[PDB]
Amino acid sequence: MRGQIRGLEMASKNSQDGISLIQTAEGALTETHAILQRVRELVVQAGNTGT
Amino acid sequence: MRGQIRGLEMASKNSQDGISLIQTAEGALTETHAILQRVRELVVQAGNTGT
Secondary structure: OOHHHHHHHHHHHHHHHHHHHHHHHHHHHHHHHHHHHHHHHHHHHHHOOOO | OHHHHHHHHHHHHHHHHHHHHHHHHHHHHHHHHHHHHHHHHHHHOOOOOOO
């Protein structure tokens, strides 16, 4: 059992490391996303003002 | 009979020597075991933090 808790605790560390990783990528993707919103504005602007 | 007690007493000495031997090995095995617990933690850490 104490084996199970040692592996548990290290797996909770691995879980937390998970959370910070996934949140790193996630926040980066929200930054990309903010770009993409400005980009879409630059599509209706690259709408050529129509022409 | 006093033969039986002479052999008895020396056999109790041999028993006690037994206890200290078996406890020597035993305690050593509990130290090994403590390692193995840290090792298991180092398996979930050699879990590669997953990857």
